[PDB]
C-alpha cells in the first residue's frame, strides 16, 4: 500500500479527480428505477391520441 501526496501547486496530470461508476441493469424483479415520462399538459373535449 502506497500513499498519495496531493498538493494545490501541482499540474493537471496529478490533481485529484473524483470518479463515480454507475453500473446498472435489469432483473426479472419489477424495475425499481425508471426514467422521465416527458412533461406535457392535458386537454379535454378533443379527439386525441
Amino acid at each position: 500500500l502506497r500513499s498519495y501526496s496531493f498538493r494545490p501547486t501541482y499540474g493537471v496530470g496529478h490533481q485529484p479527480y473524483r470518479v463515480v461508476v454507475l453500473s446498472f441493469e435489469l432483473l426479472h424483479a419489477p424495475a425499481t428505477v425508471c426514467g422521465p415520462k416527458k412533461s406535457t399538459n392535458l386537454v379535454k373535449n378533443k379527439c386525441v391520441n
Binding site: 432483473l27 426479472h28 424483479a29 419489477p30 425499481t32
Partner: protein
C-alpha cells in the same frame, strides 16, 4: 409478495366481505413455510 387485508369491527361468524390489496412487494423470494409471533404474558 402481495398482502390483502381488511379491518372490520364486531369460531368465525357468518357473512361476506371482499378484501382489498394493501401492498405489493417485488421481492423475488421463494416461500415454502411460515410461522407466527405472539405477545406473551410476563407482568
Amino acid at each position: 409478495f402481495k398482502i390483502y387485508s381488511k379491518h372490520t369491527p364486531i369460531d368465525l361468524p357468518q357473512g361476506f366481505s371482499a378484501l382489498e390489496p394493501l401492498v405489493d412487494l417485488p421481492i423475488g423470494i421463494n416461500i415454502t413455510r411460515f410461522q407466527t409471533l405472539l405477545a406473551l404474558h410476563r407482568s
